[PDB]
Design a protein around this ligand. Structure first.
Ligand SMILES: Nc1nc2c(ncn2[C@@H]2O[C@H](COP(=O)(O)OP(=O)(O)O)[C@@H](O)[C@H]2O)c(=O)[nH]1
Ligand SMILES: [Zn+2]
Lengths: 218, 208
């Protein structure tokens, strides 16, 4: 088992710029037949890996020349001459010189773009859910950058920490932004005992928190 | 076009066994060896083994010698045995030879004693602006995954699918779509939720 070691683990890089991912192996990857079987793959979220470079520097069908590979023995580099917004994903180096075949740990390509404010939307529980005695109030904080953001739920001005579920999307390949949904779940009973529900977000793009509330009188 | 068709999901009880399939199209099945790779959330991939369709000769990685067995014919199969929570992962069949490199879609393997549970779908409509964001909350299902599409997937430009979280031993996720404010509610948008594990397909129409 040949250990493949990738560096760095994550790589923030702006569109247009150059990017290089490194990969070291525990043993030389040169086969007794002269060839060096070091390859490179890209895996986009929810998809299977896709081959870019095989045998150090050859490109797979349709792969563009912005991608070049280089290296020798145990050290290898994958270079992207100029980064597009579609390059984001995880990159793995793999070897098939030695049995068993081994993959690296991956390097996540993160696109650095301009700061963007999240557009928040607040949704009250649906009649259909109330009917079952449950009540989830939801908050979407869409299309923002950086990923760093804070959300506080407030009921009649009182902060609620328990019962909130937070989920973030991977960086969007379309505009390099992130989205997040924060769900506060209550009983139908507790929901009915109050008036205004507030979703408060704290992001570096705003001095004051970005706020979204609804009062039960719609 | 070369195409490797795999399953999708599998729920199995601990200690049980299982057998995944891989249909090979678009090429001479017999010309290349069939590989199997495993991948769990923490991205790292691990090679399991390979089989030669021509003579059905086999080669396995030691760590899976005592877990998997491969068979063939244009289909290739891999069987796992004595499943545990660690065995929960995505499994891939693939032809990995230089420039002939083709992967299957991967079969998700969930080992759980848990009961297959259908999702409840609730529409999220606002309680002002140039754009209006609508949503659908898909709560309480098992196992993963679910597929939310809008207007049968013809509305795909401004969609956000949020990853599922475990809530009370049952999954919950939401999906959102943003449309011109002048188009809703005049035109209706509907989220379609598919949970194949429970052979479910629910549609939710968004109304004010
Ligand atoms: N170890 C190893 N050998 C390979 C691999 N693929 C092909 N070979 C073999 O290495 C030799 C040369 O084949 P290949 O590298 O495919 O092409 P060539 O170097 O351009 O002739 C033969 O023994 C092949 O069967 C691979 O990924 N790893
Ligand atoms: Zn109150």
């Amino acid at each position: 088992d040949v250990v493949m070691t990738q560096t760095p683990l994550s790589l923030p890089v702006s569109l247009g710029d150059q990017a290089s991912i490194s990969c070291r192996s525990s043993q030389s990857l040169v086969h007794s037949n002269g060839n060096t079987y070091l390859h490179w793959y890209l895996q986009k979220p929810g998809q299977s890996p896709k081959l870019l470079i095989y045998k150090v520097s050859n490109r797979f069908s349709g792969v563009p020349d912005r991608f070049s590979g280089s290296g020798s023995g145990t050290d290898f580099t994958l270079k992207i001459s100029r980064v597009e917004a579609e390059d984001l994903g995880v990159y793995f180096c793999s070897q098939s010189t030695h049995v068993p075949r081994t993959f690296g740990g991956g390097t996540k390509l993160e696109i650095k773009r301009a700061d963007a404010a999240p557009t928040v939307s607040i949704f009250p529980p649906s009649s259909e859910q109330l009917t079952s005695g449950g009540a989830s109030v939801v908050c979407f904080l869409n299309n923002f950058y950086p990923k760093d953001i804070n959300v506080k739920w407030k009921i009649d001005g009182k902060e609620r920490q328990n019962g909130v579920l937070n989920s973030w999307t991977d960086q969007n390949s379309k505009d390099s932004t992130y989205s997040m949904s924060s769900t506060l779940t209550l009983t139908k009973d507790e929901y009915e005992r109050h008036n205004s529900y507030t979703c408060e977000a704290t992001h570096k793009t705003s001095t004051s928190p970005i706020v979204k509330s609804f009062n039960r009188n719609e | 076009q070369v195409q490797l068709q795999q399953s999708g999901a599998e729920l199995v009880k601990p200690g049980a066994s299982v057998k995944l399939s891989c249909k090979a199209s678009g090429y001479t099945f017999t010309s290349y060896w069939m590989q199997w790779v495993k991948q769990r959330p923490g991205q790292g991939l691990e090679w399991i083994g390979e089989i030669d369709p021509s003579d059905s000769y086999t080669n396995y990685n030691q760590k899976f010698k005592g877990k998997a067995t491969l068979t063939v014919d244009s289909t290739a199969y891999m069987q796992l045995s004595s499943l545990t929570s660690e065995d929960s992962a995505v499994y891939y069949c693939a032809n990995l030879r230089g420039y002939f490199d083709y992967w299957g879609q991967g079969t998700t393997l969930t080992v759980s004693s848990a009961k297959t549970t259908p999702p409840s779908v609730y529409p999220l409509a606002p309680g002002t602006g140039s754009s209006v964001t609508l949503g659908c909350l898909v709560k309480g299902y098992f196992p993963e995954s679910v597929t939310v599409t809008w207007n049968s997937g013809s509305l795909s430009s401004s969609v956000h699918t949020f990853p599922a979280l475990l809530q009370s031993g049952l999954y919950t996720m939401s999906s959102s779509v943003t449309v011109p404010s002048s188009t809703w509610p005049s035109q209706t948008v509907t989220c379609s939720v598919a949970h194949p594990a429970s052979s479910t397909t629910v549609d939710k129409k968004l109304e004010p």
